[PDB]
UniProtKB/Swiss-Prot annotation, chain B:
<dbReference type="InterPro" id="IPR037034">
    <property type="entry name" value="RNA_pol_Rpb2_2_sf"/>
</dbReference>
<comment type="subunit">
    <text>The RNAP catalytic core consists of 2 alpha, 1 beta, 1 beta' and 1 omega subunit. When a sigma factor is associated with the core the holoenzyme is formed, which can initiate transcription.</text>
</comment>
<dbReference type="Pfam" id="PF10385">
    <property type="entry name" value="RNA_pol_Rpb2_45"/>
</dbReference>
<dbReference type="InterPro" id="IPR007120">
    <property type="entry name" value="DNA-dir_RNAP_su2_dom"/>
</dbReference>
<dbReference type="InterPro" id="IPR019462">
    <property type="entry name" value="DNA-dir_RNA_pol_bsu_external_1"/>
</dbReference>
<keyword id="KW-0804">Transcription</keyword>
<dbReference type="InterPro" id="IPR007641">
    <property type="entry name" value="RNA_pol_Rpb2_7"/>
</dbReference>
<keyword id="KW-0808">Transferase</keyword>
<feature type="modified residue" description="N6-acetyllysine">
    <location>
        <position position="1186"/>
    </location>
</feature>
UniProtKB/Swiss-Prot annotation, chain C:
<protein>
    <recommendedName>
        <fullName>DNA-directed RNA polymerase subunit beta'</fullName>
    </recommendedName>
</protein>
<comment type="function">
    <text>DNA-dependent RNA polymerase catalyzes the transcription of DNA into RNA using the four ribonucleoside triphosphates as substrates.</text>
</comment>
<comment type="similarity">
    <text>Belongs to the RNA polymerase beta' chain family.</text>
</comment>
<comment type="subunit">
    <text>The RNAP catalytic core consists of 2 alpha, 1 beta, 1 beta' and 1 omega subunit. When a sigma factor is associated with the core the holoenzyme is formed, which can initiate transcription.</text>
</comment>
Length: 668, 1327, 48
């Protein structure tokens, strides 16, 4: 009887009254999936939420997302009735239903009361990372698709291919603040993996500002002067001047060199019109020197990061906001977009292919002669076409670097190619030297269906013409990448599965333990120059003991000191190269770690809390890149041999030899 | 050259390569493969004739009532396609097979007494193939992808460095069967020739040789030779056999004439063997050492002494040979084996089967089969003979023995089906030979070991399943019968056939409903390859191997058109110009180049023959006749693109599309544009939306005509003639008599599909293109369909596009669109939905369709009629009532207060309730047609009587044509005969038609006879063809048309590969205008051009702008009303294009009313035909831009749509052709948070279905485990949406507005406590 | 069922000290926002 209730025991599942049906199982009530069925796949289905398609909305402030009016009604009714009878503008809640039944304007104003400062949380289905769960403020958009702030999509790693988001609603007081707290977009502007700004200006934004801070030889107004970036506005947004003219302006820049006060320092720069207008964007605290650069995707990356480490977060946040609007703003003001007249093939390409023909034709005759073997000529074909491609490269790249020669104080004078494709190769947005070589030049040698390399490259160029055989070689590679995504994704979740299955309950429970013990952080100088330096390993930790300088007994960093930006800069100035740092495994704290042994680095940059469970976040951030995972010695530098751990002996002719396998060759 | 459609719109031919390969029936792979299947052939055509021969005469044991084969015959198509489409019954022909049932005589030379030949007896139906390539079985047309697998024959594989993982590379082989079993061959560097059956364990070759009983010496002589050794005058001499010296180290003096040829030190290779053959001296002195160590063949104990010391096959040494030489033996027969080449494999296989008899050998073979159970000698022997030797078991048709012998380098392509040991053991000996070095292995990508069993071929094999399944119901009626009891249709049945051929045509893995939204997608679904086939391949094993593509597929297979997920390299498409071979291979067009001139002799090859011949390239410059302008042409020896000569060519690639597929042909300027936008390009082409106005491509390829016409979305004519009664729903053609049937005259009637439902619920409607008062040509077109216009594949629409990053509205993928499109709605799709209504008799209440609804008002019936069916023409939404459904309720549902009123009022009042068919929340619709399907026998009331009466008149209106036309012919005929019987001309005009007189009155009546017997016919289908499913014989299907438009969030793309999603569709007010003031329509991102490399995409933009540029010329000057000659001048520039090759210009027939009319057609753009490997060049596109009103660069000066300042450095503009994937906002927006979960538990309702909320994933779980706030996840999946009472306690709480709660033990959690509280471990909560 | 046996016979008194545990019972973990929450709770358990 007991058994039949549970799992029919394990004796056999005796059927029920004259029926093909085992007696009922509460085991099949306490062992289904993940134990029970809330926690199992399929438990619940979120209320106060909406799974809806997405869309841009280039005007959305960094702190707000867009929600459809129809969706709004459906999701906030209870709050709408809670309001309609807490105040009392509705007769009854039944008549309240009848008001939304009639779509009466009154309840839409009560809808304004339940949304205009009531934040929401957002999430996508394919999301495997914590950076895919964020919060914004709602904005009543009449439509059907959830809009967003453009650049945040890169965080969710969500393009516009059918990303249906389930936007959640923090009902309780707690969750509402928690949204605007840690889950606010404007706060997790750093990656828990590395202390760098998680969002890098995409590309539309950057070409707009590439066209802002920009140098062109033909400049209208090239020489005038201004006293205010505001009248700069009145010159280009009007149309009388160019956005590139070399104007001498007085930028009275500021610097928080005081105890929090931005010191006044006057200065005039040989800047371009757009950079003056870029100052209207750049907050005083941030200096004009960093923004007197052509602005690339990587430049603008560290650009936002400096504004943070120096001036702060608030400036940076509303600054990047400014950037977004003006990034796309002058992207329009850009005009120049694409040119067929730019994609010119040099008659040097056709010339080297002529050589690349005659050459292997002779090398094939060396085969009909028996000098080079099939295999030696196999790699030989590889050999000269490689050289041939690099020579054609040496042509198409210089063509696309100095060829824009417009008149100015003479007959002609060069400037960096104004050729749009090159602009994407300068801003480094989405046009790289290899992609360029693959449209306007010979692709190169490709992988064969076996995985090895076919001796013959893709002869011509895609921009012009090839045939299906050349195509089959290329089809391999394309289909290659495809297969990869298709499998990697599933195993990543399963990887983080076993990962959470091992770390979940690890919580930081103390701050300081009571031990000097830590481990050794070292730059893994292997092969050539260091692969992974000293600084980035120390970034966000605490020195084990009172560390000395090469000068003995001169402590450059006392035992318990948090090593952040400035101290990392400090450990890069000193000659110290090996730093013992307190480790999370050497932590004296049992059943947890101390704030010190951990550090500060996360989305935050402050001391890790007592209550912050590092266990789970460790898991996800190591499994986040899961989807991503797949002769003589003559150095070309200048140093000096410092033989280590080896007995070297002089022989005849005064030369030197090595008597062991343990041999590191240093380059002091 | 010019047709009646080419007088309307001729496709401007770019014309570079001369016409030589004419488009044949591109779907013979379907039809003619099916033609090899079903066809009357005394010859024995591989199909139905060969199959029923290969099995009939069917004789069984001790019955002797042998059923034999004659022929077969088909029934009539059961309906027309249209009815098989609407109703949904299998489009088939009842197979009537001619069978000969004869009974023999026991104890006599078998005499036939009763030769009762029951011809055309019912052996089930067989779905017929409609003459387009589809199957109309259940509703809409479904399709089956022909599949590839290893071809029957013999093949070699190596597995080099993958059979040892140490350095020992193997070379093994498998003998592929057709209809039988495999014979696997384990060959290893371990010097062992093992055999295995199909995929079984490791057996020695000799486990069956001894199991046929061949002793060691009968084994080692057939395989290995006998080197005859001579011992004379007590000295060892070797009769030198130089060929047996292949692979051996010269460790002794190999001297002839004293002159040492092969010396001691350097071994024997190949030159010194010939130095022995140079002077033919075959006698060498071998030290005693050399022979000491070889195996003897015969029994050589001491025949001079008298003792038995050894047995046979035992070594010789400085002991045993020292006895055979002092005794006196000269001739000693040994056996040959060596180490380098010929290894002692069979020697190292004998004693692996530790038996010396067939008895225990078979025990060993059966012990290999299954363990534990007893092997019997009798059962094993009978088994073997009836396996590879029994014919109904093993087979290898003209395919088996063909590739068998050709891989054996033999000559015969034919032979037996059952195995022949001569041939088998040759393979085994050659197996050794490949595991030596003398002979190599093959690849799997060589199509010689690849057989594509087509749709009809595969059908024969599936039908074979059916044939044997019921053959067990035949042979046993031959055993349980006597003499004449068993008759055809007493033995044979119908269901097995149904659950066999339909099992293939409707239940096969490659058989599924044709994605009907793009005629192209319909054709490529038909003409397609499937690597995942029956006895083929799977993807959970292959990592990427099956997926990559080999170069021997050059010319017949196209990889471009394939999906994106795990189905890459699995669901590949074929090449346009491919042709079905009988063996299951392919035959591909190659122009026979007779050493100089490229003759039009077109030969056919497969990868077998490609590997043997050298074929020239087609992209090479040839002069006039075919004599290459250059001394060279890049040819391919085995698929080797290299420098070859003008005289080394055997064949030459025919046309530019002999390798191209329909999907890639549609994409112009291939040679250019990147392969990735190409894959994803043809990808999105199988997703072209069926828009209302189907705009034809400005710049095309010529395949536009080749899809819109070669699909089933067009009403083609088998005859030509003046249109008689063109309507929207019917196309009556008054056919010309030179092609009109001399048998019962004839006219062409075509009922067009009218706004019906498709597979993808999108409106499909053939539209009448030909207007009244215009004849047609035979094989021409009368109707178009969606995604097609005037017989031209029109997927989307093309218009003014500009390239510029405009205020973030082109961010990452975003496209910017002008409000004009939705303001025109020329881009709207109509999704119609069919909602089946289940009803009809439950055991508790005979269900009716409501006819009354309780406890509500007459509003629910003011929209319905007395029947309860909603009137045709309304519009529903939200949760309206469509049709009413009666449904039994229950005594349980009634109270004692209303059990008193049941004794008064009646039984059927509160017994059945109203649980009608309702519209779930979130669904809109427009009733356009409500199809009720009456129970056969018991029809409905007056409402259904109006519907049946409607289709009855729909039959009368069409049945009238047939009559009328001969009634006129014959009447004028009457008008001339009666005058010969006494003039009555004016009189007959005033007299009744009943005035050859006998004959004509007759024909008149026969047509009228036909008239009524067809009304009867049609009405029969209408009245009793409504039976659907057993039990539920009354099903009410309602259609709901819902127009879905373009809006902020739609996914728009292009053919070229570029994708996009509309960010914010702005008013046309914000459109950048040119020097003239023309508003742009689309704005795209320029930043994607360099990366994605969409170059051909922009070139088609300029020629598209040129196709409209010339239109600009025409239009202006045409509004001025100028003569037909002026425009003609522009047309001539427009038809010479430049000064290159051709276009086949006008002025053959009168160009007055042809080109001035063609001008009314070209004042909107010009459809161009274009080759993909040598298409429009720079100066060619420039010639056309400058012929209109356009500048060189095509970079026009536009002013800001919001300001007016010119975009610096003019923006590149033009006209791009679009492509809208079917991904709509309506389809993925699931705005439900809560509506209702389930009924039995709190289980979700669907995943992609209605009432959609976020399916809480487990990855989502771990992310929420990362964020330090447990609380929000805590409540989210326990307190909220888990505690059935806890969220209602929260509902009743937040409808006040005060977030404040307590912990949440999920009650079932308290049952966990209770269950172990029931065991003994009583969990508590102390303090 | 493995777990049934595994801790049932030992009667392993695990005072809800882990996150996963806290969530199936639907209560604040002794960390994060439930830190000070369970702080009051922990010194209220077997102490006070």
């Amino acid at each position: 009887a007991v058994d039949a209730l549970l799992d029919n025991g394990r004796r056999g599942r005796a059927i029920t009254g004259s029926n093909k049906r085992p007696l009922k199982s509460l085991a099949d009530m306490i062992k289904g999936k993940q134990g029970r069925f809330r926690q199992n796949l399929l438990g619940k289905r979120v209320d106060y939420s909406g799974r809806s398609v997405i869309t841009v909305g280039p005007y959305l402030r960094l702190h707000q997302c867009g929600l459809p009016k129809k969706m709004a009604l459906e999701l906030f009714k209870p709050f709408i009735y809670g309001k309609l009878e807490l105040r009392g503008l509705a007769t009854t809640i039944k008549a309240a239903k009848k008001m939304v039944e009639r779509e009466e304007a009154v309840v839409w104003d009560i809808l304004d009361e339940v949304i205009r400062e009531h934040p929401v949380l957002l999430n996508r289905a394919p999301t495997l990372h914590r950076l895919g769960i964020q919060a914004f403020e709602p904005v009543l958009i009449e439509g059907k698709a959830i809009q967003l702030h453009p650049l945040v999509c890169a965080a969710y790693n969500a393009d516009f291919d059918g990303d249906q988001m389930a936007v959640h609603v923090p009902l309780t007081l707690e969750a509402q603040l928690e949204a605007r707290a840690l889950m606010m977009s404007t706060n997790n502007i750093l990656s828990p993996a590395n202390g760098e700004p998680i969002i890098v200006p995409s590309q539309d934004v950057v070409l707009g500002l590439y066209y802002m801070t920009r140098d062109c030889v033909n400049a209208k107004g090239e020489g005038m002067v201004l006293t205010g970036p505001k009248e700069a506005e009145r010159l280009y947004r009007s149309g009388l001047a160019s956005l590139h003219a070399r104007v001498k302006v007085r930028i009275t820049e500021y610097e928080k060199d005081a105890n929090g006060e931005l010191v006044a320092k006057t200065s005039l720069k040989d800047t371009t019109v757009g950079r003056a207008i870029l100052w209207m964007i750049v907050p005083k605290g941030l200096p004009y020197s960093i923004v007197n650069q052509a602005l690339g995707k990587k430049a603008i990356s560290k650009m936002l990061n400096t504004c943070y480490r120096i001036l702060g977060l608030k400036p940076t946040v509303i600054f990047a906001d400014q950037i977004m609007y003006t990034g796309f703003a002058y992207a329009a003001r850009s005009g120049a977009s694409v040119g067929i007249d730019d994609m010119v093939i040099p008659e040097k390409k056709h010339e080297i292919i002529s050589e690349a023909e005659a050459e292997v034709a002779e090398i094939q005759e060396q085969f009909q002669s028996g000098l080079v073997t099939a295999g030696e000529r196999y790699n030989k074909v590889i050999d000269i076409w490689a050289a041939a491609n690099d020579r054609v490269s040496k042509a198409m790249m210089d063509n696309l670097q100095t060829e824009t020669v417009i008149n100015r104080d003479g007959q002609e004078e060069k400037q960096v190619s104004f050729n749009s494709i090159y602009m994407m190769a300068d801003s480094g947005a989405r046009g790289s030297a290899a992609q360029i070589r693959q449209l306007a030049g010979m692709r190169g040698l490709m992988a064969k269906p076996d995985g090895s390399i076919i001796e013959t490259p893709i002869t011509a160029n895609f921009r012009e013409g090839l045939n299906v055989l050349q195509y089959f070689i290329s089809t391999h590679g394309a289909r290659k990448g495809l297969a990869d995504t298709a499998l990697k994704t599933a195993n990543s979740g399963y990887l983080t599965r076993r990962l959470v299955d091992v770390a979940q309950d690890l919580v930081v429970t103390e701050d300081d333990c009571g031990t000097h013990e830590g481990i050794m952080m070292t730059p893994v100088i292997e092969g050539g120059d260091v692969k992974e330096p000293l600084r980035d390993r120390v970034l966000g930790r605490v020195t084990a003991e009172d560390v000395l300088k090469p000068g003995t007994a001169d402590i450059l960093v006392p035992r318990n000191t948090l090593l952040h930006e400035q101290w990392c800069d400090l450990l890069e100035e000193n000659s110290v190269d090996a730093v013992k740092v307190r480790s999370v495994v050497s932590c004296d704290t049992d059943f947890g770690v101390c704030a010190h042994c951990y550090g500060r680095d996360l989305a935050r940059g402050h001391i890790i809390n007592k209550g912050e469970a590092i266990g789970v976040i460790a898991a996800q951030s190591i499994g986040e890149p899961g989807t991503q995972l797949t002769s003589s010695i003559q150095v070309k530098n200048k140093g000096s041999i410092k033989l280590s751990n080896v007995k070297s002996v002089v022989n005849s002719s005064g030369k030197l030899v090595i008597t062991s396998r343990n041999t590191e060759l240093k380059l002091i | 050259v010019y047709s009646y459609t080419e007088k309307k719109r001729i496709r401007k031919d770019f014309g570079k390569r001369p016409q030589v390969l004419d488009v044949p029936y591109l779907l013979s792979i379907q039809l003619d493969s099916f033609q090899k299947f079903i066809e009357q052939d005394p010859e024995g055509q591989y199909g139905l004739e060969a199959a029923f021969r290969s099995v009939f005469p069917i004789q069984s044991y001790s019955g002797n009532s042998e059923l034999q084969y004659v022929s077969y015959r088909l029934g009539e198509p059961v309906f027309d396609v249209q009815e098989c489409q609407i109703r949904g019954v299998t489009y088939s022909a009842p197979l009537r097979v001619k069978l000969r049932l004869v009974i023999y005589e026991r104890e006599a030379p078998e005499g036939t007494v009763k030769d009762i030949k029951e011809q055309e007896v019912y052996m089930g139906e067989i779905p017929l193939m409609t003459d387009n390539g589809t199957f109309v079985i259940n509703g809409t047309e479904r399709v089956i992808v022909s599949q590839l697998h290893r071809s029957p024959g013999v093949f070699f594989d190596s597995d080099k460095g993958k059979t040892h993982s140490s350095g020992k590379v193997l070379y093994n082989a498998r003998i592929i069967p057709y209809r039988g079993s495999w014979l696997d061959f384990e060959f290893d560097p371990k010097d062992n020739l093992f055999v295995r059956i199909d995929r079984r364990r490791k057996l020695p070759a000799t486990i069956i040789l001894r199991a046929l009983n061949y002793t060691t010496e009968q084994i080692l002589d057939l395989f290995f030779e006998k080197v005859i050794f001579e011992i004379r005058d007590n000295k060892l001499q070797m009769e030198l056999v130089p060929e047996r010296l292949r692979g051996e180290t010269a460790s002794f003096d190999i001297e002839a004439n004293g002159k040492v040829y092969v010396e001691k030190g350097r071994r024997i290779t190949a030159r010194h063997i010939r130095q022995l053959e140079k002077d033919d001296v075959k006698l060498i002195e071998v030290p005693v050492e050399y022979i000491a160590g070889k195996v003897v063949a015969k029994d050589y104990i001491d025949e001079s002494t008298g003792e038995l010391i050894c047995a046979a096959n035992m070594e010789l040494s400085l002991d045993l040979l020292a006895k055979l030489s002092q005794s006196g033996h000269k001739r000693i027969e040994t056996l040959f084996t060596n180490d380098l080449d010929h290894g002692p494999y069979i020697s190292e296989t004998l004693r692996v089967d530790p038996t010396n008899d067939r008895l225990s050998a078979l025990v060993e073979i059966y012990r290999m089969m299954r363990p534990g159970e007893p092997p019997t000698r009798e059962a094993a022997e009978s088994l073997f003979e009836n396996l590879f030797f029994s014919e109904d078991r093993y087979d290898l048709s003209a395919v088996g023995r063909m590739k068998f012998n050709r891989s054996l380098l033999r000559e015969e392509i034919e032979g037996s089906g059952i195995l022949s040991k001569d041939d088998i053991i040759d393979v085994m000996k050659k197996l050794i030979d490949i595991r030596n070095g003398k002979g190599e292995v093959d690849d799997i990508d060589h199509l010689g070991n690849r057989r594509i069993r087509s749709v009809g071929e595969m059908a024969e094999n599936q039908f074979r399943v059916g044939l044997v399944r019921v053959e067990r119901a035949v042979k046993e009626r031959l055993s349980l019968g006597d003499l004449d009891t068993l008759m055809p249709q007493d033995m044979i049945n119908a269901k097995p056939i149904s659950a066999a051929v339909k099992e293939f045509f409707g239940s096969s893995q490659l058989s599924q409903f044709m994605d009907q939204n793009n005629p192209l997608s319909e054709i490529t679904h038909k003409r397609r390859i499937s690597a995942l086939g029956p006895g083929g391949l799977t993807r959970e094993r292959a990592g990427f191997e099956v997926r990559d593509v080999h170069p021997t597929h050059y010319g017949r297979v196209c990889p471009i058109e394939t999906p994106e997920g795990p189905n890459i390299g699995l669901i590949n498409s074929l090449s346009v110009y491919a042709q079905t071979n009988e063996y299951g291979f392919l035959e591909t067009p190659y122009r026979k180049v007779t050493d100089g001139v490229v003759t039009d002799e077109i030969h056919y090859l497969s990868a077998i023959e490609e590997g043997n011949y050298v074929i020239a390239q087609a992209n090479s410059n040839l002069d006039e006749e075919g004599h290459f302008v250059e001394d060279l042409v890049t040819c391919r020896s085995k698929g080797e693109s290299s420098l070859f000569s003008r005289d080394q060519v055997d064949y030459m690639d025919v046309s530019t599309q002999q390798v191209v597929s329909v999907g890639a042909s549609l994409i112009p300027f291939l040679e250019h544009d990147d392969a990735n936008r190409a894959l994803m390009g043809a990808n999105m082409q199988r997703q072209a939306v069926p828009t209302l106005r189907a705009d034809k491509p400005l710049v095309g390829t010529g395949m536009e005509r080749a899809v819109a016409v070669d699909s089933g979305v067009t009403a083609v004519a088998k005859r030509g003639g003046v249109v008689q009664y063109v309507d929207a729903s019917r196309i009556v053609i008054k056919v010309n008599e030179d092609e009109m049937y001399p048998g019962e005259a004839g006219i062409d009637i075509y009922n067009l599909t009218k706004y019906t439902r498709s597979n993808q619920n999108t409106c499909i409607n053939q539209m009448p293109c030909v207007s009244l008062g215009e004849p047609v040509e035979r094989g021409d077109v009368l109707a178009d369909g969606p995604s097609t216009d005037l017989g031209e594949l029109a997927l989307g629409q093309n218009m003014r596009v500009a390239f510029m990053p405009w205020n973030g509205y082109n961010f990452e993928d975003s496209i910017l669109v002008s409000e004009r499109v939705v303001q025109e709605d020329r881009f709207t799709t109509i999704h119609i939905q069919e909602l089946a209504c289940v009803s009809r008799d439950t055991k508790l209440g005979p269900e009716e369709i409501t006819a009354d609804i309780p406890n509500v008002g007459e509003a629910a019936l003011s929209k319905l009629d007395e029947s309860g069916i909603v009137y045709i023409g309304a519009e529903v939404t939200g949760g309206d009532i469509l049709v009413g459904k009666v449904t039994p309720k229950g005594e349980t549902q009634l109270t004692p207060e209303e059990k008193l009123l049941r004794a008064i009022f009646g039984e059927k009042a509160s017994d059945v309730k109203d649980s009608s068919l309702r519209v779930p929340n979130g669904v809109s619709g427009t009733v356009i047609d409500v199809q009720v399907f009456t129970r056969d026998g018991v029809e409905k009331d007056k409402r259904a009587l109006e519907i049946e009466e409607m289709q009855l008149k729909q039959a009368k209106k069409d049945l009238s044509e047939e009559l009328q036309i001969l009634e006129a012919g014959l009447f004028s005929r009457i008008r001339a005969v009666l005058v010969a019987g006494g003039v009555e001309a004016e009189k007959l005009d005033k007299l009744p038609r009943d005035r050859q007189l006998e004959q004509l009155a007759e024909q008149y009546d026969e047509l009228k006879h036909e008239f009524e017997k067809k009304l009867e016919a049609k009405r029969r289908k209408i009245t009793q063809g409504d039976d659907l499913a057993p039990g539920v014989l009354k099903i009410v299907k309602v259609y709901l048309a819902v127009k879905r438009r373009i809006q902020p969030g739609d996914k728009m793309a292009g053919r070229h590969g570029n994708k996009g999603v509309i960010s914010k569709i702005n008013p046309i007010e914000d459109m950048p205008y040119d020097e003239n003031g023309t508003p742009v329509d689309i704005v795209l991102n320029p930043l994607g051009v360099p990366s994605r490399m969409n170059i051909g995409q922009i070139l088609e933009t300029h020629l598209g702008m040129a196709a409209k540029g010339i239109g600009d010329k025409i239009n202006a000057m045409l509004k001025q009303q100028q003569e037909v000659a002026k425009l003609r001048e522009f047309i001539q520039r427009a038809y010479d294009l430049g000064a290159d090759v051709r276009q086949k210009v006008d002025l053959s027939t009168f160009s007055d009313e042809e080109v001035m009319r063609l001008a009314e057609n070209l004042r909107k753009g010009m459809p161009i035909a274009t080759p993909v490997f040598d298409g429009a060049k720079e100066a060619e596109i420039k010639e056309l831009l400058k012929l209109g009103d356009l500048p060189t660069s095509g970079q026009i000066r536009l002013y800001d749509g919001r300001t007016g300042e010119q975009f610096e450095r003019p923006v590149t503009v033009g006209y791009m052709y679009m492509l809208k994937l079917n991904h709509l906002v309506d389809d993925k927006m699931h705005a439900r948070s809560t509506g209702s979960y389930s009924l039995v538990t709190q289980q979700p309702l669907g995943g992609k279905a209605q009432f959609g909320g976020q399916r809480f994933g487990e990855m989502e779980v771990w992310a929420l485990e990362a964020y330090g706030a447990a609380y929000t996840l805590q409540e989210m999946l326990t307190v909220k949406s888990d505690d059935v009472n806890g969220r209602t306690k929260m509902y009743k709480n937040i409808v006040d507005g005060n977030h404040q709660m307590e912990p949440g033990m999920p009650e079932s959690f308290n049952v966990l406590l209770k269950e172990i509280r029931s065991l003994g471990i009583n969990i508590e909560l102390e303090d | 069922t493995r777990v049934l046996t595994e801790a049932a016979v030992a009667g392993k008194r695990d005072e809800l000290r882990g996150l996963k545990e806290n969530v199936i019972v639907g209560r604040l973990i002794p960390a994060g926002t439930g830190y000070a929450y369970h702080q009051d709770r922990m010194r209220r358990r077997a102490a006070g």
